[PDB]
């Protein structure tokens, strides 16, 4: 259940990730893209203990509470399971605060290693936005 590229991107438009505080759409695309291939139900396990597990990687032993993880923060306060319904509403709604608390862009790991240089505004040339 992954997301497409402009299938993806056009959510993105609509969740406003288009140059918000953070950046614009193709730097979500960009950084999700590698992040989980727009995996809605990639989960990635560090051994740091916590997890990504979101098209953005949402780290449920740091945002969402999934319950699954003790120490749960839930800064983010967000339903995990709602996020990995084939929707990223939730998994976005956690990085809009993410990138507006500082990270844009840099928090995600995909981006600063396979995006950091190279054109997102390419990523979406020719999309449906």
């Not at 979500?28 to 997890?51: H, I, L, M, P, Y």
């Not at 507006?100 to 995909?110: E, K, L, Y």
Request: glycine share 10%; charged share 20%; proline share 2%.
């Amino acid at each position: 259940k992954v997301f497409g590229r402009c299938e993806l991107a056009a959510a993105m438009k609509r969740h406003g990730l288009d140059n918000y505080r953070g950046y614009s759409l193709g730097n979500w695309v960009c950084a999700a893209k590698f992040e989980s291939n727009f995996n809605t139900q990639a989960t990635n396990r560090n051994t740091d203990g916590s997890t990504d597990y979101g098209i953005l990687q949402i780290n449920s032993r740091w945002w969402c509470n999934d319950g699954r993880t003790p120490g749960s923060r839930n800064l983010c306060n967000i339903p995990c399971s709602a996020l990995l319904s084939s929707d990223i509403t939730a998994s976005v709604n956690c990085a809009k605060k993410i990138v507006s608390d500082g990270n844009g862009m840099n928090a995600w790991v995909a981006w600063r290693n396979r995006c950091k240089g190279t054109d997102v505004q390419a990523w979406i040339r020719g999309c449906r936005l």
